Amino acid sequence: INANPGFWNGPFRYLRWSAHNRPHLFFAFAIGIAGPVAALTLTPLRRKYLYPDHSPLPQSYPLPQRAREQLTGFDD
Amino acid sequence: SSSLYRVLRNAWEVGPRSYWKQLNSIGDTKSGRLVGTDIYGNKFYETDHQDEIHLRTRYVEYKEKDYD
Amino acid sequence: LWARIYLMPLLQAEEDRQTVRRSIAQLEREKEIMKGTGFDVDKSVYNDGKFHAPALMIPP
Amino acid sequence: STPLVKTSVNYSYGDYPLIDADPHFKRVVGYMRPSDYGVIGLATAALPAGICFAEWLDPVKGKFARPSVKFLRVATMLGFAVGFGAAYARSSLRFFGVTENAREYKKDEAQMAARKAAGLEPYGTSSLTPELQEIAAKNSAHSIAGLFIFPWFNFVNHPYHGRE
Amino acid sequence: AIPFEALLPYGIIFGLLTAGGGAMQVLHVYRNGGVRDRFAIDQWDSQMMERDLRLNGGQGRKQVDQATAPEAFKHNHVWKSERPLI
Amino acid sequence: MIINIVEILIFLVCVLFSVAYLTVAERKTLAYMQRRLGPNFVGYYGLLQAFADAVKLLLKEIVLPKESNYIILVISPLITLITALIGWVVIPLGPGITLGELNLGILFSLAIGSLGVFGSLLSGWSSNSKYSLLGSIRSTAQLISYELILTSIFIIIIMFVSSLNITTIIETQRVVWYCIPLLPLLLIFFIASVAETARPPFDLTESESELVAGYFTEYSGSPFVFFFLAEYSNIILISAFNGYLLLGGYLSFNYSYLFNILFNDYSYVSFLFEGLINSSAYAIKLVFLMFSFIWVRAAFPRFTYDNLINFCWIILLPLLFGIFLIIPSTLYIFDSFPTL
Amino acid sequence: MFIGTIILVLSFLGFVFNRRNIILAFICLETMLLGINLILLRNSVLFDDISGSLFAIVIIILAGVESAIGLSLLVSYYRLRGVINS
Amino acid sequence: MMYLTYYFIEITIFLAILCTFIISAKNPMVSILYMIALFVIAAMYLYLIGLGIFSLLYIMIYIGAIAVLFLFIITLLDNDYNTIITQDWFNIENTTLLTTIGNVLLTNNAFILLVLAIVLLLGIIGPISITMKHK
Amino acid sequence: PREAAAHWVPFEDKANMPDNVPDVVEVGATSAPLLSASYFIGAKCKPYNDDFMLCREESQGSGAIDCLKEGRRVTRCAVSVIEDINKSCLDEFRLHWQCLEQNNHQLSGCRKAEALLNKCVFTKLNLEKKIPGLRPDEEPVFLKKDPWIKPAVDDFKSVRAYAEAKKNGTL
Amino acid sequence: TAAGISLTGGRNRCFSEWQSFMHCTAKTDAKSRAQCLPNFEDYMECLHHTKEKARLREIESVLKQKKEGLEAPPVKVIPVKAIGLV
Amino acid sequence: MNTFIIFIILIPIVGFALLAVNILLAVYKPYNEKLGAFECGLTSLAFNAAFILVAILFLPFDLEISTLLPYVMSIYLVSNYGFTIVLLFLLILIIGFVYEINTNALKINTDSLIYKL
């Protein structure tokens, strides 16, 4: 009855066949591939329009990049 | 009918002592009018509560603990 | 994280004070035990001049 | 975009001046010459032509038969991959100053000057922290040397490009 | 109708778990001395709690907010003597 | 020391009695779904049924077949019961309210779970009854295959939290339960928890109709008690895993307004009332899950071995790898990688 | 260093002087990897260095795949002969 | 009580010697069960030296998968000083062993990770190639 | 540094400071008061903390013994600010740090007491709480209204005091 | 590479002298390399505590050969429950 | 001696106690006919590759899943970099999974009737 029509013979017909006759594999692949493509295509749109990326959090003490300025106060 | 309201209403109709007797012999709580008594001493009841299914409208309360 | 950063200098400073005290104290203790013997207790095992808190105590 | 570690400046990988020690993927594809596209086309044609000629020389099943369309489609796909790898390598080698790079040098000088005029970073702004930028740089620097083994690219906008 | 005899064992389980958790809350609070528990505590928190013990006289999680430390705080410092990991 | 002892006894008694009454609850619920009554005679309303079965089985002779390794046959149920009960040490009934407050709580749950296939793997070798061997091999296969699905859902959830402390995972769900954004993941965890527990419809492991009884064909007396107890305790424990991974654990609703109305300062009354609220929320979630196990047992016919293996390795596992790809992608798109 | 070393050496001697079975051989392989890893991890801890633990993780994974492949080889060997007489 | 935790390390060592019963087991099964016991002793020792997360990973993998495979297959086939522990406060993050391993493995050694991916790919392809007869 | 392993005993040293070292007072507040006062301590003592850390870096390994002096400076600044809080805003300070004790030390569970403490400290000590490193677009979380994350039980005393302040107009 | 990374992502226990030794080997050449042998002994010393153990050996040996009393602020060991007591 | 360790110790003691109660109270009368193995009431080995193969492929897939634990515990620290690395890792493993599916690895008379007239 229904049988694999070959992906290379016709792409959209094969996709329709897969979606009707191997829904588990078809939708597993669809969900899996939607991820990275959406990342690449949509992340810059989000940055441009919704909100920019956050400011980094500190990981260690932020050391000043300068020389000791001696100091005066709270001494002996 | 499996409802809790049925059990509460029967218990109220029957009294606490008879409720405990029924819970210790039959396990259900039945309220029905006494019909008669054996030569052996058991008592037989019939009920017209509409919440009682077919074949549960007559029952017996044995006279002894080792009922049979 | 910023709260912890603001607390870190004082907690550290306290810990450095405790470190100096216990390192020195152990130095005098070991020196006192080693009096009367031809051994230098002040000599670091390290070649740099840097301060080196002891590791490796004797079991108590 | 401030470097965390010290890098060599204008180091000579070859006889020609250095343009970029670790060029970004977009630059390497952007600076590709028509000859490099010729290389891509030649690989894309060669690989299925190779399978057909191999069938001519020594038929798989005694009697000559043209290779099926599945295999030819495969052939084109993989040939394009080889051609693109070769062409990317050629362009990157131009960037290091190993092959002749006058055109690429001038184009880079102009692009950098324009970017400086616009106030932008010479190598772009990164969504990573500087530590991850140094790590990405140390992972992608000279990775074209292992083209035979594995493909690795620079996709990160880091500042370690070895220039002044 | 709703069969209450079928729900009695569920009610027993529900009451058992509920009472057990309530009693565990009270025991944990009583062990803590009138405050809730500290969960997901990292190295920083463990060290802060040890310093707290040095400050409040060993009274568990009791807190003191006096600016200046008692005298014994300078001497009750503890290093740990750890056996050789053979 | 005393407080530790009292807490452990309270928790242990609650868990053991909850397991004991789960059996009665199963019989009664199936009974009412089958238009019958189930146990209502041993004890008032059949409330002592489980203890009746217990006492009987503890008075039953132990039979050690001739070709059997008697040590293994007696110790395999014992180890499966021990691990099934050890799994409870990390389950919280409130913030920090647990016997073991481990920063590696999730890893502990998964490890002690992975120690759960050894009863099945060992009993077939111990019984030597052929029915037991077939059941044992098929069970070991099924259980490991579905343990994969369970571990994968664990990982997907930790993608949202970045912590292996169970209380933290529960606390992060005050904003929303994770079963709302990941409803399909909740369905799969149920279908897989049913299979990992070896319950109908996926009862191929000890199915009476294909194989008389199952791996336990030869188990009489206390060893049978141990397999029975371990099975129902594991049912409740995996319902617990479901609860805190996906149903928000002990979170019900924001009762801050109510407490500010009722009380005016902290007191043992208010701490107890809060403890009861959290524990009631978590226990009602457990009750719905156990009811669902019983419901599914009532409604569906069994799978075959080929069918369930095909399910796990061709329908479920591809979807889970697809989700592995699509969850971090959504985090990256919206810049919401969770902090430690 | 002690537990790992002894597991390694005893598993090695079990492997070499095996004249009982091939399963003993598999087990000696696995336990040798165990002892190697225990020595490694103790050294990692003593140095407070992460490279030791990273290599320990890699050993774990590679021992997994090695066990998989080895058991597959044993099964393919069995398919022809029906029995392992060692 | 204190001598218990002190000699705990030496006890795991002794039980490990004893369990390595693996070689002398009459039954290979029994030998595999004693291998599992050895793995639990290893998990105990790992916690003692400060690496409990490794105790749990060992339980997860070597007992949960490798011992399970072993059993599946065979059912089917016929320095006296003490160290000073000191505190300091430079670490404000909650970074543990697992987080640091993830950090280095996924950034400093992404290459090792991808090569491990190839190794696991081998661990899939190989067994299929030699245990299955195509067509 | 790693935490202690299988068997350890804590031991106490009974020696005194060497007398050449100037003595210094020690901070006596515990974890909850310290976490409550951290932002003000930072705001006031930032230059001294920075100088202490720069000394420790430049010493290149002898930090403990070369950086005692500005360590004394750091501790003195901290004690000064804590004393000022104890003199001027004690009740709100206690509200805040007892609330923290109840909520596993999460600042998200004590916003109501923190608002009162912040207002008191700003008015009577001229210290402001501020989160460094945020762009103007990003909003400090402790200033955010209607947060996603809320405590289990709003603290009773803090709620009462906050409503009272709303009536008085101080907040 | 993970060299230099501690179990918590910081710098390992023995980083400082290792980094000093690398500063050497950067500044010097092959002929001049022997010039900072000292930095390398410091590194190996941090790693293995050998001269430190030797020095402690001589200290203990002379201590146990002494009957005269010791008058110096001593070291006291306390139970973990007794941290901050009195 | 916290609640954790005491509970862990307590559970096997309860198991052993139930076992000892059974041994002490139950009768024990073995005899040859009772000791026989039960197979439907009366006294009385090749397997398929997929049996081997489920078990054997469990180990690589388990290792793949458990290799993501370091990732999910360090997602924020690795940022968008580690993100990409773990995508590549996952896709490489997905290739092996595709091979497994297409080879049908775990899966276990239509002639006509012709008369020579």
mmCIF file of N, CA, C and O in Angstrom, chain E residues 39-77:
data_model
loop_
_atom_site.group_PDB
_atom_site.id
_atom_site.type_symbol
_atom_site.label_atom_id
_atom_site.label_comp_id
_atom_site.label_asym_id
_atom_site.label_seq_id
_atom_site.Cartn_x
_atom_site.Cartn_y
_atom_site.Cartn_z
ATOM 1 N N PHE E 39 19.278 25.903 53.565
ATOM 2 C CA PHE E 39 19.386 24.897 52.524
ATOM 3 C C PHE E 39 20.232 25.426 51.375
ATOM 4 O O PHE E 39 20.304 26.633 51.134
ATOM 5 N N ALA E 40 20.879 24.495 50.675
ATOM 6 C CA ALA E 40 21.736 24.806 49.536
ATOM 7 C C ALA E 40 22.868 25.738 49.947
ATOM 8 O O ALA E 40 23.036 26.832 49.407
ATOM 9 N N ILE E 41 23.655 25.292 50.916
ATOM 10 C CA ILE E 41 24.695 26.122 51.506
ATOM 11 C C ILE E 41 26.042 25.737 50.914
ATOM 12 O O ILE E 41 26.420 24.560 50.904
ATOM 13 N N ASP E 42 26.760 26.724 50.395
ATOM 14 C CA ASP E 42 28.032 26.475 49.743
ATOM 15 C C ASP E 42 29.167 26.579 50.757
ATOM 16 O O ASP E 42 28.945 26.655 51.967
ATOM 17 N N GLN E 43 30.406 26.575 50.267
ATOM 18 C CA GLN E 43 31.558 26.695 51.152
ATOM 19 C C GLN E 43 31.540 28.015 51.907
ATOM 20 O O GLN E 43 31.845 28.064 53.106
ATOM 21 N N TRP E 44 31.193 29.096 51.212
ATOM 22 C CA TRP E 44 31.106 30.405 51.845
ATOM 23 C C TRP E 44 30.172 30.362 53.044
ATOM 24 O O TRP E 44 30.500 30.874 54.118
ATOM 25 N N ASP E 45 29.002 29.749 52.875
ATOM 26 C CA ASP E 45 28.031 29.708 53.962
ATOM 27 C C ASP E 45 28.537 28.884 55.136
ATOM 28 O O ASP E 45 28.342 29.262 56.294
ATOM 29 N N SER E 46 29.180 27.750 54.866
ATOM 30 C CA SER E 46 29.724 26.946 55.954
ATOM 31 C C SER E 46 30.761 27.733 56.743
ATOM 32 O O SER E 46 30.779 27.699 57.981
ATOM 33 N N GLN E 47 31.634 28.461 56.045
ATOM 34 C CA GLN E 47 32.644 29.245 56.748
ATOM 35 C C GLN E 47 32.013 30.385 57.537
ATOM 36 O O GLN E 47 32.434 30.680 58.663
ATOM 37 N N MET E 48 31.003 31.042 56.964
ATOM 38 C CA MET E 48 30.306 32.095 57.694
ATOM 39 C C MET E 48 29.663 31.546 58.956
ATOM 40 O O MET E 48 29.697 32.190 60.009
ATOM 41 N N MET E 49 29.081 30.353 58.875
ATOM 42 C CA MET E 49 28.455 29.763 60.048
ATOM 43 C C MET E 49 29.489 29.392 61.101
ATOM 44 O O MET E 49 29.242 29.538 62.305
ATOM 45 N N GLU E 50 30.660 28.922 60.678
ATOM 46 C CA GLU E 50 31.713 28.660 61.653
ATOM 47 C C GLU E 50 32.148 29.939 62.359
ATOM 48 O O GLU E 50 32.327 29.961 63.587
ATOM 49 N N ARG E 51 32.314 31.016 61.600
ATOM 50 C CA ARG E 51 32.645 32.294 62.213
ATOM 51 C C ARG E 51 31.551 32.736 63.176
ATOM 52 O O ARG E 51 31.841 33.275 64.251
ATOM 53 N N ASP E 52 30.290 32.495 62.815
ATOM 54 C CA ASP E 52 29.182 32.803 63.713
ATOM 55 C C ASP E 52 29.312 32.043 65.022
ATOM 56 O O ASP E 52 29.062 32.596 66.098
ATOM 57 N N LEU E 53 29.673 30.763 64.946
ATOM 58 C CA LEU E 53 29.867 29.983 66.164
ATOM 59 C C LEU E 53 30.956 30.591 67.030
ATOM 60 O O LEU E 53 30.826 30.655 68.255
ATOM 61 N N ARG E 54 32.047 31.032 66.406
ATOM 62 C CA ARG E 54 33.089 31.703 67.176
ATOM 63 C C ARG E 54 32.565 32.968 67.843
ATOM 64 O O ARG E 54 32.985 33.301 68.957
ATOM 65 N N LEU E 55 31.657 33.682 67.181
ATOM 66 C CA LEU E 55 31.178 34.962 67.698
ATOM 67 C C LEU E 55 30.128 34.850 68.796
ATOM 68 O O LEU E 55 30.201 35.588 69.780
ATOM 69 N N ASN E 56 29.148 33.968 68.660
ATOM 70 C CA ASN E 56 28.033 33.960 69.600
ATOM 71 C C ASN E 56 28.202 32.960 70.736
ATOM 72 O O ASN E 56 27.233 32.683 71.447
ATOM 73 N N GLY E 57 29.395 32.412 70.924
ATOM 74 C CA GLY E 57 29.636 31.536 72.048
ATOM 75 C C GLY E 57 29.235 30.094 71.849
ATOM 76 O O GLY E 57 29.004 29.387 72.835
ATOM 77 N N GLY E 58 29.147 29.629 70.607
ATOM 78 C CA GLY E 58 28.751 28.261 70.354
ATOM 79 C C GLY E 58 27.267 28.003 70.429
ATOM 80 O O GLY E 58 26.861 26.843 70.556
ATOM 81 N N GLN E 59 26.443 29.041 70.357
ATOM 82 C CA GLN E 59 24.996 28.874 70.479
ATOM 83 C C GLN E 59 24.339 28.679 69.120
ATOM 84 O O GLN E 59 23.371 29.352 68.773
ATOM 85 N N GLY E 60 24.868 27.740 68.346
ATOM 86 C CA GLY E 60 24.231 27.358 67.096
ATOM 87 C C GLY E 60 24.152 28.514 66.122
ATOM 88 O O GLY E 60 25.157 29.135 65.770
ATOM 89 N N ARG E 61 22.940 28.821 65.674
ATOM 90 C CA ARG E 61 22.730 29.856 64.677
ATOM 91 C C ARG E 61 22.352 31.192 65.291
ATOM 92 O O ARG E 61 21.762 32.033 64.606
ATOM 93 N N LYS E 62 22.661 31.409 66.565
ATOM 94 C CA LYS E 62 22.338 32.691 67.169
ATOM 95 C C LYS E 62 23.183 33.789 66.545
ATOM 96 O O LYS E 62 24.342 33.574 66.179
ATOM 97 N N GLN E 63 22.597 34.970 66.418
ATOM 98 C CA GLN E 63 23.234 36.079 65.733
ATOM 99 C C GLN E 63 23.476 37.221 66.709
ATOM 100 O O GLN E 63 22.671 37.472 67.609
ATOM 101 N N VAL E 64 24.599 37.910 66.522
ATOM 102 C CA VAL E 64 24.935 39.107 67.283
ATOM 103 C C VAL E 64 25.273 40.215 66.296
ATOM 104 O O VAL E 64 25.921 39.966 65.274
ATOM 105 N N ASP E 65 24.809 41.431 66.578
ATOM 106 C CA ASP E 65 25.034 42.557 65.684
ATOM 107 C C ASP E 65 25.805 43.686 66.353
ATOM 108 O O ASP E 65 25.679 44.845 65.943
ATOM 109 N N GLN E 66 26.580 43.383 67.386
ATOM 110 C CA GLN E 66 27.432 44.394 67.984
ATOM 111 C C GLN E 66 28.611 44.660 67.061
ATOM 112 O O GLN E 66 29.177 43.735 66.473
ATOM 113 N N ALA E 67 28.975 45.934 66.924
ATOM 114 C CA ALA E 67 30.001 46.302 65.958
ATOM 115 C C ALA E 67 31.342 45.676 66.300
ATOM 116 O O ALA E 67 32.098 45.282 65.406
ATOM 117 N N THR E 68 31.655 45.573 67.583
ATOM 118 C CA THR E 68 32.980 45.185 68.031
ATOM 119 C C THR E 68 32.941 43.799 68.653
ATOM 120 O O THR E 68 32.024 43.473 69.411
ATOM 121 N N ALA E 69 33.939 42.988 68.327
ATOM 122 C CA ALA E 69 33.957 41.609 68.773
ATOM 123 C C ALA E 69 34.503 41.500 70.191
ATOM 124 O O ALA E 69 35.394 42.254 70.586
ATOM 125 N N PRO E 70 33.972 40.570 70.978
ATOM 126 C CA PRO E 70 34.565 40.267 72.284
ATOM 127 C C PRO E 70 36.036 39.897 72.163
ATOM 128 O O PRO E 70 36.572 39.661 71.080
ATOM 129 N N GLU E 71 36.690 39.844 73.324
ATOM 130 C CA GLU E 71 38.120 39.551 73.358
ATOM 131 C C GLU E 71 38.412 38.119 72.935
ATOM 132 O O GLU E 71 39.406 37.862 72.247
ATOM 133 N N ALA E 72 37.573 37.169 73.347
ATOM 134 C CA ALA E 72 37.863 35.768 73.073
ATOM 135 C C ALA E 72 37.810 35.441 71.587
ATOM 136 O O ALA E 72 38.330 34.398 71.180
ATOM 137 N N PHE E 73 37.200 36.302 70.770
ATOM 138 C CA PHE E 73 37.159 36.042 69.336
ATOM 139 C C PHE E 73 38.551 36.027 68.728
ATOM 140 O O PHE E 73 38.791 35.314 67.748
ATOM 141 N N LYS E 74 39.475 36.814 69.277
ATOM 142 C CA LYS E 74 40.820 36.860 68.718
ATOM 143 C C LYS E 74 41.593 35.577 68.992
ATOM 144 O O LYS E 74 42.539 35.264 68.262
ATOM 145 N N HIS E 75 41.215 34.819 70.024
ATOM 146 C CA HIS E 75 41.965 33.629 70.400
ATOM 147 C C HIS E 75 41.282 32.310 70.079
ATOM 148 O O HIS E 75 41.963 31.280 70.070
ATOM 149 N N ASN E 76 39.975 32.295 69.820
ATOM 150 C CA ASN E 76 39.270 31.048 69.550
ATOM 151 C C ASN E 76 39.259 30.694 68.072
ATOM 152 O O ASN E 76 38.354 29.995 67.613
ATOM 153 N N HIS E 77 40.244 31.177 67.321
ATOM 154 C CA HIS E 77 40.383 30.796 65.926
ATOM 155 C C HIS E 77 40.757 29.326 65.824
ATOM 156 O O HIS E 77 41.467 28.790 66.677
#
